[PDB]
RNA sequence: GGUCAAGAUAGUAAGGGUCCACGGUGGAUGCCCUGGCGCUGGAGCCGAUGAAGGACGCGAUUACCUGCGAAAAGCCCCGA
RNA sequence: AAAGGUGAAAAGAACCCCGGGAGGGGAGUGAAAGAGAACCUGAAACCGUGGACUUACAAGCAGUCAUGGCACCUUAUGCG
RNA sequence: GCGAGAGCUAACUUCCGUAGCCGAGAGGGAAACAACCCAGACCAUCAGCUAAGGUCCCUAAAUGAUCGCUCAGUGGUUAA
RNA sequence: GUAGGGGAGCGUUCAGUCCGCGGAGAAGCCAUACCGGAAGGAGUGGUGGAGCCGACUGAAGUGCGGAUGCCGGCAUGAGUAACGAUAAAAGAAGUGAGAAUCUUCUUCGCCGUAAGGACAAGGGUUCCUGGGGAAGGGUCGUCCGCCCAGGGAAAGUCGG
């Protein structure tokens, strides 16, 4: 018996061509280019998962030394204080305190200054 | 509602103020230029603009507009001094492909594109 | 540049043929419908022809015969039209614009005297 | 061959952008002081053949 | 509230972009069979009594195909 | 070479309207005309009309991740 | 890279020896950059510590501490 | 983790078996935010209008982005180059739904050892009349060498 492609390819093709959403020009309309775009998208996808994790910590650190410097300190110094006050092991959350709770952030600056000098 | 089978016997499908000139021996883009000035204009302005637009697509277009008018009145009861070009568009009909001879033996194909000129009349009504 | 002042659209011989051709037509018919431009160029040549004829003497006649090669039109211009224009300080030619043609899409005009 | 030739297909975008000036300008239609059919400024009214008096037949 | 100054910021779309709705084009896909292929078996020569294959015809009206052959879309006999 | 397909049945659309016509809109037939003779389905490329969000200090393998704005609510209201 | 021949103790040169990497190796660094430096990616996280490299702003983190040097932008184009 | 070797599976057509579904709507097509570790699979809705899913087992013309691949459709260049001898053309009148282009009149201009006329070859009804106006005609046609019908072709001496 004969077993022509019929239905299999078009379905295979529509799947790809639907991942292609706000894809500019041919990248959303023609299969070969839509599919091709996705290979490169795969690189970006797998990489950006572990990248966001560097991206955020960066943002986190930036907010910390901003507030640390508001109370005559800095990230390097502040963190060492909290480290030297072993009791203090915030690390995660610490950026939100600086940004939302200034009263609370000050307390932790004052504790960090002790454990150091 | 019931089902599809029933609906088809129940509600029988109308095309109010619609008329189409099918298989018009003219290129779509060429025809669109004319149709583009007629969109949204009052059926009377449309009739007049057409008589003065120097393009040859003017005649066929005008002919659809008068048919759409007639249809709106006769087949649909609608009142004339309330009429306007709700919608108008040109779609492409089947291309007449012809073979032209060229230098040093080669041939080419001339595309003699056809048009489907449809215009839709509606009653304006501010209120 | 090109700050000249005349207008052809063919070759020397032809420009003169057209001029004389349409001049005979207007003078014979009194009103001709032609292309706007073609009519514009005609206006002065025909206006100048009436002034020559406005002489009345043989020379004035014979001069008209250099451009009007129709025995009858020369008589019409000499003996009929020019005398009627006696106290008109030149100007009998008027151009009206009729409106666009089908084939070329050219704007037509009328020229009458 | 056919010496200067296009390098890449021009996109639907790029092709369309070039046509942003191709739109016809509607004639400025006036209404005839007589026969009351619309006409072109500086031309004889098509309908009556008027231009102050009647010049053209019908 | 108004004039002057200093800042900041919105909306316009000639045309474009993404998405949605509705269409046109085109003939994939599904369904179908009026057409083919293979194997198995049967059957297996035609012609000077003029073949195989054709030309020109034959119709009330006939270009094409069919059937025919100036007795020409048919004539006679037998059977169903 | 390529070329298939109205409908169960031609009941193949009398009559009306715009148009020289082509083409359409109705009326009628039919279960359906969402089958009308460019007659089964009618993908995609491609060409359009309409709507949403948008774009006229911008350097671009066109995505990807993050956040904000607008819109929407039929595996779908914390979820997108 | 190291150890030699060839070659000008030239070549991003050639031909061996030997180790490591690329080939088939993503991630960090070295602006950019197969090979150098660090380190071998089973998947998920809007957690933590470190390597080489860094901590004025672009750009994560001391415009750090102490005793000195250079004043040529040397740093951030080679010799007699 | 490349060549390569090894393992487990997804999907398509056909077949045998079983369970079924379907004009109160099958396949196919279209939309989707659901499921599975992947190939993939389901729900709902929309179209369609007569066939078909699931499970086991069997067999293959069984899975496509590439081959300056083949067939077909459609884009780009682009409303661009061109519209085929630089022998012109003008006006009037007519016809017609419609006229630069068709008819007629008066001019103009180009050939005139030809761009006139008569054979031969070759072509095959192109001839004439009346109609037509899809397509062919590089534009447009009311016209034509195009389309339809009817007609026309005459030999003892001319060629054979
Ligand atoms: C006149 C048109 C005619 O072209 C020519 O004849 C010119 C003159 C000829 O030049 C020539 O052949 N020559 C011979 C040398 C002088 C002249 C030349 C060469 C290069 C550029 N210009 C002129 C080419 C340029 C030459 O290419 C050249 O070939 C060389 C072998 C190598 C060159 N490379 C390096 C760029 C290439 O361009 C080729 C081989 O043709 C014949 C090109 C191929 C594609 C070809 O056959 C075309 C279809 C050709 N046939 C046709 O009918 O039309 C064409 C286009
Ligand atoms: Mg030295
Ligand atoms: Mg391909």
Q: What's the CA gap between D40 and B48, in Å, rounded? A: 11
Q: Pick from B118, B121, B101, B99: which is nearest to B110 by CA?
A: B99
- Residues sharing a CB contact under 8 Å with residue A23, sequence separation 6 or more, in sequence order: A34, A37
- D49-54 CB contacts, 8 Å cutoff, 24+ apart: D51/C96
Six token digits for residue D57: 């037949």
| Cβ atoms of residues A109 and A98 within 8 Å | no
CA torsion, points B1, B5, B9, B13, in degrees to nearest 10? 80
Residues on chain D touching B53 (C-beta within 8 angstroms): 24, 26-27
Rg (CA), chain C: 15
Q: What's the CA gap between C113 and C95, in Å, rounded? A: 9
CA torsion, points A79, A85, A90, A92, in degrees to nearest 10? 30
CA of B103, nearest ligand number: 1
| Cβ atoms of residues B52 and B90 within 8 Å | no
Total number of residues shown for chain C: 113
Q: What's the CA gap between B57 and B64, in Å, rounded? A: 11
Q: What's the CA gap between B62 and B24, in Å, rounded? A: 13
Domain region containing A76:
1-117
- Tell whether the torsion through CA atoms of C52, C58, C62 and C65 is positive or negative: positive
Q: What angle do CA C51, C53, C55 make, to 5 degrees?
A: 85
Nucleotide nearest to A36 (CA to C1'): H65
Identify the closest residue of chain A to D11 by CA–CA distance: A25
> Crossing angle of helices A75-84/A31-70, nearest 10°?
70
Stated in angstroms to one decimal place, the resolution of this structure is 3.2
Six token digits for residue D29: 């239609």
DSSP 8-class letter at D30: E
Q: What angle do CA D47, D53, D55 make, to 5 degrees?
A: 60
**Taking the CB of residue B76, how many other CB atoms lie within 10 A of it?**
15
Q: What's the CA gap between C66 and C24, in Å, rounded? A: 12
> Is residue B98 helix, strand or coil?
strand
List protein-proximal bases of chain G (any atom < 7 A from a CB): 27, 43-49, 55, 60-63
From the options 3.30.420.40, 3.90.470.10, 3.30.43.10, 1.10.760.10, give the CATH code of B1-127. Answer: 3.90.470.10
Subunits close to A (at least 3 CB pairs below 8 A) = D
| Cβ atoms of residues A61 and A94 within 8 Å | no
Number of structural domains found in chain A: 1
The beta strands (E) that lie in chain C are given as: 31-35, 94-100, 107-112
Q: What's the CA gap between C79 and C81, in Å, rounded? A: 7
CB pairs under 8 A between A and D: 3
- Residues sharing a CB contact under 8 Å with residue D42, sequence separation 6 or more, in sequence order: C97
**Taking the CB of residue C57, how many other CB atoms lie within 10 A of it?**
8
**Taking the CB of residue B58, how many other CB atoms lie within 10 A of it?**
18
Q: What's the CA gap between A28 and A20, in Å, rounded? A: 5
CA torsion, points B46, B49, B51, B57, in degrees to nearest 10? -80
Residues on chain D touching B37 (C-beta within 8 angstroms): 24, 26
Q: Is D45 annotated as a binding residue?
A: yes
Q: Is the CB of A31 under 7 A from strand G?
A: no
| Cβ atoms of residues B64 and B90 within 8 Å | no
> Is residue A40 helix, strand or coil?
helix
Subunits close to D (at least 3 CB pairs below 8 A) = A, B, C
DSSP 8-class letter at B91: E
Q: What's the CA gap between B102 and B110, in Å, rounded? A: 12
DSSP 8-class letter at B22: E
Nucleotide nearest to B91 (CA to C1'): E24
- Residues sharing a CB contact under 8 Å with residue D32, sequence separation 6 or more, in sequence order: D38, D39, D45, D47, D48, D50
Chain A and chain C touch, per 3+ beta carbon pairs within 8 A: no
- Tell whether the torsion through CA atoms of A83, A88, A93 and A94 is positive or negative: negative
B39-50 in b/e form (b: 16+ CB < 10 A) is eebebebbbbbb
Is C8 an 8 Å CB contact of chain D? no
Q: What domains are there in chain C, each with its CATH number? A: 1-113 (3.90.1030.10)
Distance in Å from H8's C1' to B5's CA comes to 49
Helix (H) or strand (E) holding A24: none
CA torsion, points B73, B79, B82, B83, in degrees to nearest 10? 0
Six token digits for residue C22: 């349409």
Task: Quickly tell me which residue has 């005839």 as its tokens.
Answer: D32
List protein-proximal bases of chain E (any atom < 7 A from a CB): 14-19, 23-26, 28-30
Task: Quickly tell me which residue has 């009858």 as its tokens.
Answer: C72
Task: Quickly tell me which residue has 């309330």 as its tokens.
Answer: B82
């Amino acid at each position: 018996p004969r077993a022509k492609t019929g239905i299999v390819r078009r379905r295979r093709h529509k799947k790809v061509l639907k991942r292609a959403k706000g894809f500019w020009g041919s990248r959303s309309k023609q299969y070969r280019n839509a599919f091709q775009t996705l290979l490169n998208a795969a690189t970006y996808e797998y990489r950006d998962r572990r990248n966001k994790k560097r991206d955020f910590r960066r943002l986190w650190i930036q907010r910390i030394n901003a507030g640390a410097r508001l109370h005559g300190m800095n990230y390097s110094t502040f963190i060492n204080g909290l480290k030297r006050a072993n009791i203090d092991l915030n690390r995660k959350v610490l950026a939100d305190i600086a940004a939302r709770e200034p009263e609370a952030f000050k307390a932790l600056v004052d504790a960090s200054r002790n454990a150091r000098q | 509602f019931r089902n599809k089978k029933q609906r088809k016997q129940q509600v029988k499908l109308r095309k109010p103020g619609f008329a189409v000139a099918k298989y018009v021996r003219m290129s779509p883009r060429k025809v669109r230029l004319v149709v583009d000035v007629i969109r949204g204009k009052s059926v009377q302005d449309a009739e007049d603009l057409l008589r003065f637009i120097p393009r040859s697509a003017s005649e066929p277009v005008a002919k659809v507009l008068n048919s759409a008018k007639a249809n709106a009145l006769h087949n649909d009861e609608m009142l004339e001094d309330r009429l306007f070009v709700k919608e108008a568009y040109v779609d492409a009909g089947p291309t007449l492909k012809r073979l032209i001879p060229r230098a040093r033996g080669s041939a080419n194909i001339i595309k003699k594109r056809t048009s489907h000129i449809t215009i839709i009349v509606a009653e304006k009504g501010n209120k | 540049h090109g700050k000249a002042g005349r207008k052809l659209n063919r070759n020397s011989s032809a420009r003169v043929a057209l001029a004389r051709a349409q001049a005979t037509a207007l003078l014979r018919e009194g009103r001709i419908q032609t292309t706007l431009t073609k009519a514009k160029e005609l206006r002065p040549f025909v206006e100048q022809l009436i002034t020559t004829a406005k002489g009345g003497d043989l020379h004035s006649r014979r001069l008209v015969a250099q451009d009007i090669h129709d025995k009858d039109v020369v008589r019409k211009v000499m003996d009929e039209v020019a005398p009627k224009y006696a106290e008109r300080p030149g100007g009998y030619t008027r151009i009206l614009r009729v409106g666009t043609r089908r084939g070329d899409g050219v704007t037509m005009a009328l020229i009458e005297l | 061959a056919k010496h200067p030739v296009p390098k890449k297909k021009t996109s639907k975008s790029k092709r369309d952008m070039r046509r942003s000036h191709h739109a016809l300008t509607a004639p400025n239609l006036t209404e005839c002081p007589q026969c009351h059919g619309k006409k072109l400024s500086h031309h004889i009214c098509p309908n009556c053949g008027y231009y102050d008096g009647r010049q053209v037949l019908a």
